[PDB]
C-alpha cells in the first residue's frame, strides 16, 4: 500500500507465487511484483523477527485479557 | 435604510442595462430567459430580451417603454439606447450628488444632444453612389468574414452586389427600394461554389417543361395559373378550350403550378407555354410582380394586355441541372442565384452568409445617408462634445462633459464583448479621432472604428461597417428623452 | 498533507508580487512599531513570523539559498509554491506521494544538466570596470527601482573592482555608511570605515596610531568636592594619555572639561560611536574593548593608519583607511532624504556585491528575464513524453513549475500572463533561448535578452533550482501532525 500499488492484488500474487514455488517470494517496492527477496538482497535480522513475534503475542494477549477499566 | 429615490431609479436603470449589456454586438453572449412555468428561451439580440424580460420597477418600465418605441421606428439599437440612457443616468446622478440641480443637467443634456445631431449630419457619408464599388464588396466580405470561403471572396462579393444593384425598383417618391425576397436560392449538384454564375431571372430546378422555347422569343407573356392541366371525365375537362381561349387573348408562356398537360407537347411548339410542377408561391408572387401579371384562379369569364411580358427565354443546362430562364421581365424582380455544390445542407453557412450579405447591402442601399459603425461615431462625438462644452461657461458645462464621457460606453461595450480590454481599444479610438480635428490634413481619419475580429482599430468607411443615420439619430434622441424623464423624477 | 501545501501556497503568494523590477513594495511594521516600506523579499520574510512548519521549511531553504548565493530567494519561494500547487493537482489525480517525489527528483536531475547549455559567459575578467558595469546592472535593477540602476550599479561595482586580487573576495570588505542629507547623486565611493565625530581638534597627518576602544560610555566642602572630581578626571585622562595614545572613543556625549583635557594633550575626542560599530571597529583594527577609563594599556589598544576629517558629502566624517591589508575595506557613502529609502539602496548594493562575488566564483551567465525558465520548461516538457511510466506527470508539472516564473514576472508589470507566456513559448522555439519578456512596453511583447544585456549568474539559478526542488520534495514527505 505504501508504494501506491493495490493492497490485495499484490498479496494475492505473492501468495500464488509462494504456493506454486517454494521460494520465499516478497514484494518489490518499485513495480509491485513478487520478488525472490534472496537474490535482490533485502535480508532482515533473524533476532529482530523473533523478538517481534514474542513482543506482539504477549502484548496482544495482555490487552485481550483486560476488562472493567477502573478510575483509580 | 434608503434615501434620494432618484438614485433608486438610476440604480434600477443600471441593473436593467447590465442585464443586456453583455449581448451588444454580433458577437454577444446569450441569455436564457426562464418563465414561471419553466420554459426557457435563448437569444442574442436584446430587443427580444427587453420584450421578454419581466420588469417590475416603475423607473425601469419607462426605459422598457422607450426601447419598445425605438423598436417601432427603425428596429435597431434598443440595447444601445438602453445602455446610453443608463450611462447618462449614472453621470447625472453623480452631478446631482456634487450639488448641481437637475434642471441645469437636463438643459445641458438637451443642448448636447442637439449639438451631437448637428455635428453628425456634417460628418457622415453619402458615397453610396454608383461609384461605390469596393466599399460594398468589403462590407459584404466583413459580413461574410471568418469563413473558409475567404480564398475566393471577391467573386461572390461582386456577384452578389451586381445581383442586388441590377434588380432595384424606383418608387413613387423616386427613392430606390429593394425587397429582400426578390432574390432566392437555387441549389445544384456537382462542382463546388467557385463556378456559380448569377442567373438574370428566376430559375426553378425541376422537371423540364418543354423544348419549344426558342433561343430568344420576341414576346414571352406570363399567363400564370393555379390548377392542374389534367384530363377529366368554359370546358368541363380543363385541357383545351381554356388554354385555346387564353392563347387567343395572346398568352405566350402559360404558367401552370400544378400538373402538366397530357398533350402539352403539341400545344407548346405552336404557342410555347410552360408546364412544370411545384411552382413556389414565394417565387410565383415575385415573378407575377416582376412581369406584371396576376394569378388567375379561374379562366371562365383582362387577359390580353394585363398579363406580363418577358424579353427572352433560354433553355440550357447549368451544373448538370435544367433551369427555366424566365428573365428580363417588365419589372426587375425575377432573379436567382445558383448554389453549385451537392446539397443545401453542406452549404447552409454559405447560403446564410449570402443572405446576411444581401441584408447588410440593402441596409445601406436605402437611406442613402450612412455613418461608420464599430463605435467610430461615438468616439467622434465624444471628442466633439468636450470641446463644445468647454466653450459654454454656463452651469451646463459639466452636464455636456458627462454626456460626452458617457457616450463612449458603446465602443467600450463592443470591445468588452469582443474579448479585448476595452481600455486600449477606446483609448486608441479617441487618439485617432483627436488628430482628426486638431490636425486638418489628417481629416481622412474620422472613419476609424474598432474591428471585432482582430480587436484593433481599423477604418470602417473602407471596410464597410455601416449604419443608417436615422437609426443613430433616433437612438440618441430617445436615450436623451429617457434620461431627462428619469431625472425629472423626485 | 494538503494543509502544508496550502500554507506554502499563501507563503509564495505573499511575496510573489515583489518579484522582478516591478515589485509592489509592502509596508512593514516591526515589533518596535517602525513604519517601514520596502520591496525586498528577504526583509518581509524576516519580519513575517512564519508559523506553519511547512512555511518555516521553505523559509529555511530560502535562507540557505541566500547564505551561499546571496540572491534569488524570491525565485525559490515562487518556484516551490508552483511545485507544491502542481503536486496537489497530481495527488488529486491519484498519484502517490512517492511517485511525484521521484518524478520531481529526476526532473531536477535532468534540468541540472540541461542548464549549462544556456551560457553566455562574462567577457574577460573582473576588471574592465565599464564591463562589470553592464554585468552588475541586472541584479540592482531588479531589487530597487529600474530608474536609479545606472548610477547605483556604477557606484557598487567601482568600489568592488578595487581589489580583484588572488581571486578571493569578502562581502564584509564592502561596507556601507549611512549619511543623511541630499539626493543619491552626491553618493560616491570612498575607502576605509567612515562615520561622523564631534570634536574639531584633530590632526590629519597620522601614521600608525594607538586606538582606544570603549565598551561603556560616559561652602568650602562643595569646592573641595569639585576639585577632587577634577583631579580624579585628571588621573583618568592621564591614564588614557599613558603609552602615547592619541584617539579616544565613547558611546555617550561630549564634555566641555573632557574635551579641554583632550585638547591639552592633543587628543581627538572621537564620539557618536554607534552600537553597531564597537566590534566591527575591533575586527577591522584588531583591538579589544575596555570597560572603564582605568584599564587602558599598551597591549589593550588598537592601531589605525590615517585618521582625518573629510568634508566631502557636505558632512564631517572620520575615516580609518589603509588598514593592515592596505586596501581591504572600502566603504560607500550613501546620501538620501530619509532612512527608509536609504536601506533599500543598502540592500540593493548588498545584492549587487553578492552577485559580483558569484561572478568571481564562476564566469558563466544565463539569459534571465524569463528566457532560461521558459527554455528549461520547453526542454523538460519535451523530455517528458520520452520517458514512459508514471513519472511523466511529475516531469510535466515540473516544467510548468518553471513556466510559473515568467508568468509572475509579467503579472507584476500589469500584463496578461497567459497571452505573454503563450507568445514567449511560441517564439522561443524559433527565436531561441536569448529572447525574454520586455518590461517597458505595456503590450505583451517579447525582446531578446542578449543585446538588452539583462543577464544573471548561472550558479545562482543552479543552486536556486536545487534548493527549491529539495524543499518541495522534503515538504511533500510529511503527512500530518496534530496542531
Amino acid at each position: 500500500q505504501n508504494s501506491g500499488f493495490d493492497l490485495q492484488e499484490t498479496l494475492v500474487k505473492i501468495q500464488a507465487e509462494h504456493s506454486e514455488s517454494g521460494q520465499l517470494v516478497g514484494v518489490d517496492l518499485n513495480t509491485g511484483e513478487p520478488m525472490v527477496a534472496a537474490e535482490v538482497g533485502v535480508w532482515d535480522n533473524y533476532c529482530v523477527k523473533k523478538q517481534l513475534l514474542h513482543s506482539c503475542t504477549v502484548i496482544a494477549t495482555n490487552i485481550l485479557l483486560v476488562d472493567e477499566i477502573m478510575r483509580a | 435604510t434608503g434615501e434620494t429615490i432618484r438614485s433608486q431609479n438610476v440604480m434600477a436603470a443600471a441593473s436593467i442595462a447590465n442585464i443586456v449589456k453583455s449581448s451588444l454586438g454580433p458577437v454577444g453572449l446569450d441569455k436564457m430567459l426562464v418563465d414561471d412555468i419553466g420554459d426557457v428561451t435563448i437569444t442574442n439580440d436584446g430587443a427580444t430580451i427587453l420584450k421578454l424580460l419581466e420588469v417590475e420597477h416603475p423607473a425601469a418600465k419607462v426605459l422598457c417603454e422607450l426601447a419598445d418605441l425605438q423598436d417601432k421606428e427603425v428596429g435597431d439599437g434598443t440595447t444601445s439606447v438602453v445602455i446610453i440612457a443608463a450611462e447618462l443616468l449614472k453621470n447625472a446622478d453623480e452631478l446631482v450628488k456634487q450639488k448641481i440641480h437637475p434642471t441645469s443637467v437636463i438643459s445641458g443634456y438637451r443642448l448636447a444632444c442637439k449639438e451631437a445631431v448637428r455635428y453628425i449630419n456634417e460628418n457622415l457619408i453619402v458615397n453610396t453612389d454608383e461609384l461605390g464599388r469596393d466599399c460594398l464588396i468589403n462590407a459584404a466580405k466583413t459580413s461574410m468574414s471568418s469563413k473558409i470561403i475567404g480564398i475566393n471572396g471577391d467573386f461572390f462579393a461582386n456577384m452578389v452586389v451586381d445581383a442586388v444593384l441590377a434588380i432595384k425598383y424606383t418608387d413613387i417618391r423616386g427613392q430606390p427600394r429593394y425587397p429582400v425576397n426578390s432574390v432566392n436560392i437555387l441549389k445544384a449538384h456537382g462542382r463546388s461554389q467557385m463556378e456559380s454564375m448569377l442567373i438574370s431571372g428566376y430559375a426553378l430546378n425541376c422537371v423540364v417543361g418543354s423544348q419549344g422555347m426558342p433561343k430568344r422569343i420576341v414576346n414571352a407573356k406570363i399567363a400564370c395559373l393555379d390548377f392542374s392541366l389534367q384530363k377529366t371525365k368554359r370546358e368541363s375537362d380543363i385541357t383545351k378550350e381554356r388554354i385555346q381561349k387564353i392563347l387567343a387573348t395572346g398568352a405566350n408562356v402559360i404558367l401552370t403550378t400544378g400538373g402538366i398537360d397530357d398533350m402539352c407537347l403539341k400545344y407548346f411548339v405552336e404557342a410555347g407555354a410552360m408546364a412544370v410542377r411545384r411552382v413556389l408561391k414565394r417565387d410565383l408572387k415575385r415573378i407575377a410582380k416582376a412581369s406584371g401579371a396576376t394569378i388567375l384562379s379561374t379562366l371562365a369569364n383582362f387577359e390580353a394586355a394585363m398579363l406580363g411580358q418577358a424579353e427572352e427565354v433560354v433553355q440550357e443546362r447549368i451544373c448538370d441541372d435544367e433551369l427555366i430562364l424566365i428573365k428580363n421581365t417588365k419589372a426587375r424582380t425575377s432573379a436567382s442565384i445558383i448554389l453549385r455544390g451537392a446539397n443545401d445542407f453542406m452549404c447552409d453557412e454559405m447560403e446564410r452568409s449570402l443572405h446576411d450579405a444581401l441584408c447588410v447591402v440593402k441596409r445601406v442601399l436605402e437611406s442613402k445617408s450612412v455613418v461608420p459603425g464599430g463605435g467610430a461615431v461615438e468616439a467622434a462625438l465624444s471628442i466633439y462634445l468636450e470641446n463644445y462644452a468647454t466653450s459654454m461657461g454656463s452651469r451646463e458645462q459639466l452636464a455636456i462633459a458627462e454626456f460626452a464621457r458617457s457616450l463612449l460606453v458603446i465602443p467600450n461595450t463592443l470591445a468588452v464583448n469582443a474579448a479585448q480590454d476595452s481600455t486600449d481599444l477606446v483609448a486608441k479610438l479617441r487618439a485617432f479621432h483627436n488628430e482628426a480635428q486638431v490636425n486638418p490634413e489628417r481629416k481622412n481619419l474620422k472613419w476609424i472604428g474598432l474591428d471585432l475580429s482582430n480587436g484593433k482599430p481599423r477604418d470602417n468607411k473602407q471596410a464597410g461597417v455601416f449604419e443608417p443615420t436615422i437609426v443613430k439619430v433616433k437612438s440618441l434622441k430617445f436615450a436623451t428623452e429617457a434620461a431627462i424623464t428619469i431625472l425629472r423624477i423626485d | 498533507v494538503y494543509r502544508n501545501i496550502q500554507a506554502c501556497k499563501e507563503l509564495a503568494q505573499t511575496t510573489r508580487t515583489a518579484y522582478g523590477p516591478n515589485g509592489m513594495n509592502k509596508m512593514v511594521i516591526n515589533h518596535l512599531e517602525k513604519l517601514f516600506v520596502t520591496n525586498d523579499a528577504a526583509t518581509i520574510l524576516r519580519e513575517l513570523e512564519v508559523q506553519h512548519p511547512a512555511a518555516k521549511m521553505i523559509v529555511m531553504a530560502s535562507h540557505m539559498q541566500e547564505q551561499e548565493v546571496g540572491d534569488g530567494t524570491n525565485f525559490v519561494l515562487v518556484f516551490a509554491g508552483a511545485l507544491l500547487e502542481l503536486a496537489e493537482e497530481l495527488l488529486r489525480i491519484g498519484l502517490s506521494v512517492s511517485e511525484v517525489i521521484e518524478g520531481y527528483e529526476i526532473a531536477c536531475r535532468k534540468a541540472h544538466e540541461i542548464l549549462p547549455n544556456l551560457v553566455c559567459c562574462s567577457a574577460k575578467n573582473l576588471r574592465d570596470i565599464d564591463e562589470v558595469s553592464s554585468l552588475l546592472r541586472t541584479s540592482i535593477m531588479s531589487k530597487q527601482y529600474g530608474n536609479e540602476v545606472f548610477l547605483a550599479k556604477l557606484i557598487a561595482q567601482a568600489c568592488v573592482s578595487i581589489f580583484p586580487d588572488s581571486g578571493h573576495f569578502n562581502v564584509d570588505n564592502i561596507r556601507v555608511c549611512k549619511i543623511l542629507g541630499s539626493g543619491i547623486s552626491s553618493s560616491s565611493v570612498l575607502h576605509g570605515m567612515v562615520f561622523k565625530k564631534e570634536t574639531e581638534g584633530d590632526v590629519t597627518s597620522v601614521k600608525d596610531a594607538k586606538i582606544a576602544v570603549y565598551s561603556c560610555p560616559f561652602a568650602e566642602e562643595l569646592m573641595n568636592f569639585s576639585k577632587g572630581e577634577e583631579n580624579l578626571m585628571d588621573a583618568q585622562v592621564k591614564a588614557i594619555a599613558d603609552t602615547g595614545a592619541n584617539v579616544v572613543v565613547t558611546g555617550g556625549k561630549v564634555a566641555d572639561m573632557a574635551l579641554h583635557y583632550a585638547n591639552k594633550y592633543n587628543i581627538m575626542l572621537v564620539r557618536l560611536n554607534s552600537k553597531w560599530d564597537l566590534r566591527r571597529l575591533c575586527k577591522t583594527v584588531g583591538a579589544t574593548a575596555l570597560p572603564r577609563l582605568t584599564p587602558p594599556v599598551l597591549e589593550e589598544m588598537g592601531h589605525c593608519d590615517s585618521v582625518y576629517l573629510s568634508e566631502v558629502g557636505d558632512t564631517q566624517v572620520v575615516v580609518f583607511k589603509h588598514e593592515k591589508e592596505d586596501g581591504a575595506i572600502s566603504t560607500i557613502v550613501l546620501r538620501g532624504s530619509t532612512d527608509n529609502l536609504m536601506d533599500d539602496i543598502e540592500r540593493a548594493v548588498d545584492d549587487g556585491v553578492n552577485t559580483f562575488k558569484v561572478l568571481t566564483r564562476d564566469k558563466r551567465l544565463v539569459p534571465g528575464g524569463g528566457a532560461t525558465e521558459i527554455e528549461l520548461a520547453k526542454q523538460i516538457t519535451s523530455y517528458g513524453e520520452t520517458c514512459p511510466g508514471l513519472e511523466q506527470y511529475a516531469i510535466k508539472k515540473f516544467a510548468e513549475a518553471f513556466e510559473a516564473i515568467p508568468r509572475a514576472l509579467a503579472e507584476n508589470s500589469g500584463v496578461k500572463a497567459n497571452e505573454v507566456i503563450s507568445k514567449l513559448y511560441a517564439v522561443h522555439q524559433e527565436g531561441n533561448k536569448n529572447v525574454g519578456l520586455d518590461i517597458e512596453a505595456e503590450v505583451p511583447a517579447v525582446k531578446d535578452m542578449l543585446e538588452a544585456g539583462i543577464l544573471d549568474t548561472y550558479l545562482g539559478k543552479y543552486w536556486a533550482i536545487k534548493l527549491a526542488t529539495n524543499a518541495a520534495v522534503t515538504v511533500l514527505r510529511v503527512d500530518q501532525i496534530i496542531m
Binding site: - | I19, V34, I42, K233, N343 | I93, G94, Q392
Partner: protein
C-alpha cells in the same frame, strides 16, 4: 453574478453528469431510485435515472432534454454524451477562472470538434453492407450485453430485412431511411419463432362483414375523410377506397355497386403507413377531381383470420418502404428491446450506406482522437491552445470510467494505454470492459457505427458551447 453564473451552470452540468458517470459499459453499476412513498427500484439505464430524477437547475433540464432528443434520434449512446459534455464543461473551469473570455474557449472547442471529426473519418475501418457474417459480428458487438443475448439470432435476420424494407429514394440512391414507417406488428402468444417479415403494409382492421369483393389483383387505394361522393368515386373506377368512417350493410351494398372496399376505426399511425406503402391520394373537391385523383397502389390483397381475430393483409405494395414485420412471443418485456436494437442495426446499415465504416470500441477511438488532437496542438500556436489540449485530455473519460467500474486501477492502465498510442503508429488499442486489461479491439471484436460516434461528439461539443454561451438566467430568480 458575471462568471459565477457560468460556474454554477457548469457545476450543475458536472453533477448531473457524474450521477450516471458509472452506469455505462458492460459492467454498469445499479443506481437506486426511491419515490416519496418508500418504494425502491434499481436500474442500469441512465435515461431512466435522468427521467425519474428532479432537477431545479434550467441548465440541467437543458442537458436532460439534449440526452432525450439524442435518444430517439439515434438510440443508444445516451450516457456517453452526458459524460462527455459534463467533462468538457468541468474542464472549462480552469480557463474561466483565468479571466479568459468564453468566446475564445468556444472557438477552441469548435476547432477541436472539427479536428475530432476529421480524425474519426480518418481512423474508421471500412465495412461493406449486406455481408451477413460481419453483420452478425456487429450484432454481437452492439446488440449483446443486453437481455437479448440468447435471442439475438432472430433479431439478426429481423434487422437484416428491416434495413432493406424502409429504403427511401428521396435525395439520392437509397441512403435515406426512417424508423417509424416500418409496420411493426407486436402480438404476444405462442412460440417466438413465428415472427417473420412480409413485403407490404399490414393493417389490423377489416370490414365487419367481408362477404364482398375485398381482395383484387390491383389495389389502388384512394384516401377519403355521401351518396354523391359514392358515385363520384367512379370517376376512375378504383377497386379499393380507404376512409375513416363506419360502414353499414346498406353502405356495403353501395360499396359493391361501386366496387370499392372502405375501412373504419383505423389509426392515423396505420393510415399514413398505408399511404406511404401504396402511394394513395386524398381528394373530395369536385374542382380538384382530375386525373391526379387515383394513384397506382398495391398488386395483391389477402384476407386472413390470424389468431382467430379479424385482420387485413396488403402485400405487393407500390412503394416497398412500409412493409410488414411481424413480432411473436410470450410477452413484450424483450421484444421492445428487440425493436430498439434493430433500430440501432438499421442506423448501422444506413450509415454504412452513407459512410461504409466502423471505429474501434472500448475507448480505443477516444484515446486515438485524443492523441491526434494533442499531437496536432504542438504545431498550432495562440492563446487558445490550452482549451484545445484540455478537450483532448478530457475526452479520455470513456476508457477511464470503463477501467473504473471494472476493478482495475485507472491511472496505471490509462498511462499504459497512452504509451501504446504515442510511440506506435497504426495500433488504436483499447481497454477490455470485462477483464479491465488492455487488448487490441480489432482482435476482441468491438466496433461502433460512425453515425453514433459523430453524433455523440458533435452533440457533446454543441452542448458544451451552448452552456458556456449562456451568460444570464435572469427572467426571475
Amino acid at each position: 453574478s458575471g462568471r459565477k453564473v457560468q460556474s454554477g451552470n457548469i457545476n450543475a452540468a458536472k453533477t448531473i453528469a457524474d450521477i450516471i458517470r458509472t452506469c455505462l459499459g458492460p459492467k454498469s453499476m445499479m443506481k437506486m431510485l426511491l419515490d416519496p412513498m418508500g418504494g425502491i427500484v434499481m436500474t442500469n439505464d441512465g435515461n431512466a435515472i435522468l427521467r425519474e430524477i428532479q432537477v431545479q437547475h434550467p441548465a440541467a433540464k437543458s442537458m436532460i432534454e439534449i440526452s432525450r432528443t439524442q435518444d430517439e434520434e439515434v438510440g443508444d449512446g445516451t450516457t456517453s454524451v452526458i459524460i462527455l459534455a459534463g467533462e468538457m464543461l468541468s474542464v472549462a473551469e480552469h480557463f474561466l477562472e483565468q479571466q479568459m473570455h468564453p468566446t475564445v474557449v468556444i472557438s477552441a472547442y469548435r476547432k477541436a470538434l472539427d479536428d475530432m471529426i476529421s480524425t474519426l473519418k480518418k481512423i474508421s475501418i471500412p465495412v461493406d453492407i449486406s455481408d451477413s457474417d460481419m453483420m452478425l459480428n456487429i450484432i454481437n458487438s452492439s446488440i449483446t450485453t443486453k437481455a437479448i443475448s440468447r435471442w439475438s439470432s432472430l433479431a439478426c435476420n429481423i434487422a437484416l430485412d428491416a434495413v432493406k424494407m424502409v429504403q427511401f429514394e428521396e435525395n439520392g440512391r437509397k441512403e435515406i431511411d426512417i424508423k417509424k414507417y416500418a409496420r411493426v406488428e407486436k402480438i404476444p402468444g405462442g412460440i417466438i419463432e413465428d415472427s417473420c417479415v412480409l413485403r407490404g403494409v399490414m393493417i389490423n382492421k377489416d370490414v365487419t362483414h367481408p362477404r364482398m369483393r375485398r381482395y383484387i389483383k390491383n389495389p389502388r387505394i384512394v384516401l377519403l375523410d355521401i351518396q354523391q361522393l359514392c358515385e363520384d368515386i367512379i370517376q376512375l373506377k378504383p377497386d379499393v377506397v380507404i376512409t375513416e368512417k363506419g360502414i353499414s350493410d346498406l353502405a356495403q351494398h353501395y360499396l359493391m355497386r361501386a366496387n370499392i372496399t372502405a375501412i373504419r376505426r383505423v389509426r392515423k399511425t396505420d393510415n399514413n403507413r398505408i399511404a406511404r406503402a401504396c402511394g394513395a391520394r386524398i381528394v373530395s373537391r369536385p374542382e380538384e377531381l382530375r386525373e391526379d385523383d387515383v394513384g397506382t397502389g398495391a398488386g395483391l390483397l389477402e384476407i386472413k383470420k390470424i389468431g382467430d381475430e379479424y385482420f387485413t393483409f396488403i402485400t405487393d405494395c407500390k412503394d416497398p418502404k412500409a412493409c410488414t414485420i411481424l413480432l411473436r412471443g410470450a410477452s413484450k418485456e424483450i421484444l421492445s428491446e428487440v425493436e430498439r436494437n434493430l433500430q440501432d442495426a438499421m442506423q448501422v446499415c444506413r450509415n454504412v450506406l452513407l459512410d461504409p465504416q466502423l471505429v474501434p470500441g472500448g475507448g480505443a477511438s477516444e484515446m486515438a482522437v485524443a492523441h491526434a488532437l494533442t499531437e496536432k496542438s504542438k504545431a498550432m500556436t495562440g492563446v487558445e491552445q490550452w482549451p484545445y489540449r484540455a478537450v483532448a485530455q478530457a475526452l479520455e473519460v470513456i476508457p477511464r470510467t470503463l477501467i473504473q467500474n471494472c476493478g482495475a486501477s485507472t491511472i496505471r492502465l490509462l498511462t499504459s494505454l497512452r504509451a501504446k498510442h504515442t510511440q506506435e503508429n497504426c495500433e488504436t488499442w483499447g481497454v477490455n470492459g470485462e477483464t479491465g486489461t488492455l487488448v487490441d479491439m480489432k482482435e476482441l471484436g468491438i466496433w461502433e457505427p460512425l453515425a453514433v460516434k459523430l453524433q455523440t461528439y458533435k452533440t457533446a461539443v454543441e452542448t458544451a458551447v451552448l452552456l458556456l454561451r449562456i451568460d444570464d438566467i435572469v427572467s426571475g430568480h
